[PDB]
């Protein structure tokens, strides 16, 4: 095992570690997809952790520094500040795949901006962060799962990751709750007669259940628009994609399994993901 082998080892228990939902799905890829991944998703978890988890705020500028210096200079030895074996992993990939940086950075700064946390007035500002924190995940993820980076692949993925922080949002209004946090819209709950302090204390009332209903009805309907146009990506990509998505379609029908409970985190388990890639995998 090399050097870089290790680096991305590393990269690839990070996300063992922190992705229950997806791991499984991406450990199917080939070899280099695979990896790739990896390393993306563990700089992704290292930008959503340093604050929230570990509270660290120059952690947060160190990890931008460190992306900084891999975009401007993709093949000097860099002393990276913030992770070193992960930023050696991402810069491997960026020799390799071209990265969108700038995808970096939105998620970089919405992160930042999810301290001075405001609940959204209008689901387009729910939406906006579904961009900043989800959507710009699928754009980076586009080259390593795509040999066609056109406008049509950026979207899906964009759109794909879009809907995915929503379903994100459904299983966890009653955690993030705890936390302080309604990403629910302040148009939306004003509208439905809801306030979410209140069913948190009292139990799902059918005024919470038409409204989660109401975001259900969204991401479902962009989970079956994205799936349409899964045949942008690359043929091996494409059947693990359809499993990532569809264990987080299976994740709604869990929470309507348990009542829409507010107080347990509801997950799919591993024998039924095998289950769904089983089903998928007939098609291809
Ligand atoms: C190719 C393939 C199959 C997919 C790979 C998936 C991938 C690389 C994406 C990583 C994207 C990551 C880590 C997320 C960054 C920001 C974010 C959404 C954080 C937490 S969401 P939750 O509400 O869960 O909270 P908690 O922060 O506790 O996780
Ligand atoms: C997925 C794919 C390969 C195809 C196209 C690109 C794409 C859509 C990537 C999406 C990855 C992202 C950020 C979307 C959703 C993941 C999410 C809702 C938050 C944290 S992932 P955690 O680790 O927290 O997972 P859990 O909390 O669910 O366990
Ligand atoms: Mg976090």
């Not at 952690?59 to 520094?65: A, G, V």
């Not at 969204?218 to 494409?238: C, L, N, P, Y």
């Amino acid at each position: 095992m090399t050097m870089m082998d290790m680096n991305f080892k590393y990269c690839h228990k990070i996300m063992k570690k922190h992705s229950k939902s997806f791991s499984y799905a991406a450990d199917l890829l080939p070899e280099d997809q695979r990896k790739a991944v990896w390393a993306i998703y563990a700089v992704c978890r290292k930008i959503d952790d340093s604050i929230d988890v570990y509270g660290d705020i120059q952690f947060l500028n160190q990890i931008k520094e460190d992306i900084q210096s891999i975009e401007k200079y993709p093949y000097e030895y860099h002393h990276f500040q913030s992770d070193r074996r992960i930023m050696m992993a991402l810069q491997h990939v960026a020799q390799h795949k071209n990265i969108a940086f700038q995808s970096f950075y939105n998620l970089i700064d919405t992160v930042y901006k999810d301290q001075h946390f405001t609940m959204f007035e209008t689901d387009a500002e729910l939406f906006g962060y579904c961009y900043g924190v989800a959507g710009t995940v699928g754009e980076v993820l586009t080259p390593i799962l795509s040999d066609h980076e056109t406008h049509q692949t950026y979207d899906v993925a964009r759109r794909l990751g879009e809907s995915l922080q929503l379903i994100n949002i459904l299983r966890d209004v009653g955690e993030d709750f705890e936390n302080e946090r309604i990403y629910f819209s302040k148009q939306r709950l004003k509208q439905y007669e809801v306030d979410i302090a209140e069913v948190y204390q009292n139990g799902v009332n059918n005024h919470y259940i038409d409204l989660w209903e109401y975001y259900a009805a969204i991401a479902e309907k962009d989970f079956r628009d994205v799936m349409d146009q899964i045949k942008v990506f690359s043929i091996e990509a494409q059947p693990i994609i359809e499993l990532a998505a569809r264990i987080y379609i299976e994740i709604l029908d869990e929470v309507r399994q348990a009542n829409y409970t507010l107080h347990e985190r509801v997950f799919v388990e591993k024998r039924k993901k095998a289950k769904l890639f089983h089903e998928i995998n007939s098609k291809y």
